[PDB]
Curated annotation (Swiss-Prot):
Effect of R267 to A/E: Nearly abolished polyglutamylase activity
Function of the molecule: Polyglutamylase which modifies tubulin, generating polyglutamate side chains of variable lengths on the gamma-carboxyl group of specific glutamate residues within the C-terminal tail of tubulin. Mediates both ATP-dependent initiation and elongation steps of the polyglutamylation reaction. Preferentially modifies the beta-tubulin tail over an alpha-tail. Competes with monoglycylase TTLL3 for modification site on beta-tubulin substrate, thereby creating an anticorrelation between glycylation and glutamylation reactions.
Residue sites binding L-glutamate per the record: R175, K186, K282
Compartments in which it is found: Cell projection, Cilium; Cytoplasm, Cytoskeleton, Cilium basal body; Cell projection, Dendrite; Perikaryon
Domain remarks: The enzyme uses its core to engage the disordered anionic tails of alpha- and beta-tubulin and the flexible c-MTBD (cationic microtubule binding domain) region to bind the microtubule and position itself for beta-tail modification. The c-MTBD region is positively charged and becomes ordered when bound to microtubules: it interacts with a negatively charged patch on alpha-tubulin. The presence of positive charges in the c-MTBD region is essential for proper binding.
Positions bound to Mg(2+) 2: Q264, N266
Protein's name in the database: Tubulin polyglutamylase TTLL7
Site residues (Binds negatively charged residues of beta-tubulin C-terminal tails), renumbered to this chain: R67, R267
Chain positions recorded as Mg(2+) 1 binding sites: D251, Q264
Residues the entry annotates as binding ATP: K121, Q136, E137, Y138, I139, K149, F150, D151
Part of the full-length chain shown: 40 to 484 of 887
Gene: TTLL7
Subunit structure: Interacts with both alpha- and beta-tubulin (via C-terminal tubulin tails).
Organism: Homo sapiens
Family: Belongs to the tubulin--tyrosine ligase family.
Domain named TTL: residues: 1-297
Length: 331
């Protein structure tokens, strides 16, 4: 009998799906359960305590891309190494660290008589301090849905970091604006792709661009995760299955040219269910994730790494080599 500890969640759909999968729920003090689910990120010590048969829904060190500042700092190191591969990230300056660096760019822009809008997050807007802010270039012309600016919440499953295996769910949430955009309603991505089709846009390239965005983003995180995981698990035999898996929420904005931009990654996305769209999408994300783990004592998921394209794998492997190289430089 396969069991599950579900004390770490507050979402019914998590409890529901796990119950539907055939898991037997343990008391909240049982630490020997096959499956361990916790909404928030987990202390690396807890991951170290696990046995090789157990599976927990968090990777140690994934916060290097899940933290907005750590994402920027690592993407910055990467862009200065492989710019032509990482153009999906808006220009970001970490305050109050690169306070001087940001001021110069505005001056250089002022010199060239060019205007640009900037957004500040943990939210406001700026154009023309000494605290932990974060300035970022504002995508001014986003893809509009009936005159509305919308957000893309896509879900990514990472089953292993050694070897790296990444899955992309072919559905998600669309958060349209309340008032029409000038330089809200909730939809599904399946609906949005149907929209793209009717308006004659490349849906295939949409997913293709999204997939490369995710893989290259996790490539940045891979050397941080792989190290940390091996630190937590020095009792894992050479080719033994991963103890960790993750459902990550990628927040993505599309521009007028339908180029996907990465805003942030959430390691603890809400799995609340108030609407039918919320139920169907999030149930499918969780249910198919557990099926793929195959905890035995796919559906709308697509494996984006490793890709079936041999030429693309070579590109990814080259970036991984770069990623691990820059990783050493920082230490």
């Amino acid at each position: 009998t396969i069991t599950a500890n579900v004390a770490g969640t507050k979402f019914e759909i998590v409890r529901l799906v796990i119950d539907e999968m055939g898991f037997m729920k343990t008391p909240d003090e049982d630490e020997t359960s096959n499956l361990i689910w916790c909404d928030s990120a987990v202390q690396q010590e807890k991951i170290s305590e696990l046995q090789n048969y157990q599976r927990i829904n968090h990777f140690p060190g994934m916060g290097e891309i899940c933290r907005k500042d750590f994402l920027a700092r690592n993407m910055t190191k990467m862009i200065k190494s492989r710019p032509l591969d990482y153009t999906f990230v808006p220009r970001t300056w970490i305050f109050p660290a690169e306070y001087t660096q940001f001021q110069n760019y505005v001056k250089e822009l002022k010199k060239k008589r060019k205007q640009k809008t900037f957004i500040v997050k943990p939210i406001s807007l700026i154009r023309n301090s000494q605290d932990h802010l974060i300035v970022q270039e504002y995508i001014e012309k986003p893809f509009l849905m009936e005159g509305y600016k919308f957000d893309l919440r896509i879900y990514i499953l990472v089953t292993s970091c050694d070897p790296l295996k990444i899955f992309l769910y072919h559905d998600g949430l669309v958060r349209m604006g309340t008032e029409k955009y000038i330089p809200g309603s909730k939809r599904s991505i399946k609906w949005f792709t149907e929209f793209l089709q009717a308006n004659q846009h490349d849906v295939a390239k949409f997913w293709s661009d999204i997939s490369e965005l995710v893989v290259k983003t996790l490539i940045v995180a891979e050397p941080h995760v792989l190290h940390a995981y091996r630190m937590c698990r020095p009792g894992q035999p050479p080719g033994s299955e991963s103890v960790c898996f993750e459902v990550l929420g990628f927040d993505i904005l599309l521009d007028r040219k339908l180029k996907p931009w990465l805003l942030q990654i959430n390691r603890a996305p809400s799995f609340g269910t108030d609407q039918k769209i919320d139920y169907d999408v999030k149930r499918g994300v969780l249910l198919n994730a557990l099926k793929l783990l195959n905890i035995r004592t796919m559906g709308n998921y697509r494996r984006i790494y490793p890709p079936e394209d041999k030429a693309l794998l070579e590109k990814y492997e080259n970036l991984l080599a770069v990623a691990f190289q820059t990783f050493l430089s920082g230490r």
